């Protein structure tokens, strides 16, 4: 699209990260551990996925 593909970033969609990043296993987006509505305070050492890699108003889980 305009600004690249939009859905492709090595940083946080919301909190504009740059260093430490936790990304999905599906899409090319990176987050903290609480940038989305289904936020965690713990670091998911196993698996982790986005709510919908977008506005977390929908049901991700
Ligand atoms: Zn994703
Ligand atoms: Zn973040």
Measure 11 CA to ligand 2 centroid, in angstroms.
8
Say which experimental method was used.
Answer: NMR
> How does strand 30-31 pair with strand 22-23?
antiparallel
Domains of the chain: 1-61 (3.30.40.10)
Ligand (nearest to CA of 21): 2
Determine the distance separating the centroid of ligand 1 and the alpha carbon of 51, expressed in angstroms: 7
Distance, CA of 18 to CA of 20 (rounded, Å):
7
Contact residues for 22 (Cβ-Cβ < 8 A; gap 6+): 30, 31, 32, 33, 43, 44, 48
Distance 35 CA to ligand 2 centre (A): 4
Q: Compute the distance from residue 34 Cα to the ligand 1 centre, in Å.
A: 14
Contacts of 19 (CB under 8 A, 6+ apart): none
Pseudo-torsion of CA 35, 38, 43, 44, nearest 10°? -120
Contact of 11 with 30, CB cutoff 8 Å: yes
């Amino acid at each position: 699209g305009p600004l690249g593909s939009d859905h492709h970033m090595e940083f946080c969609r919301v909190c504009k990260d740059g260093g430490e990043l936790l990304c999905c296993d599906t899409c090319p987006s990176s987050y903290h551990i609480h940038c989305l509505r289904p936020a965690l305070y713990e670091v998911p050492d196993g698996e982790w996925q986005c709510p919908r890699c977008t506005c977390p108003a929908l049901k991700g889980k």
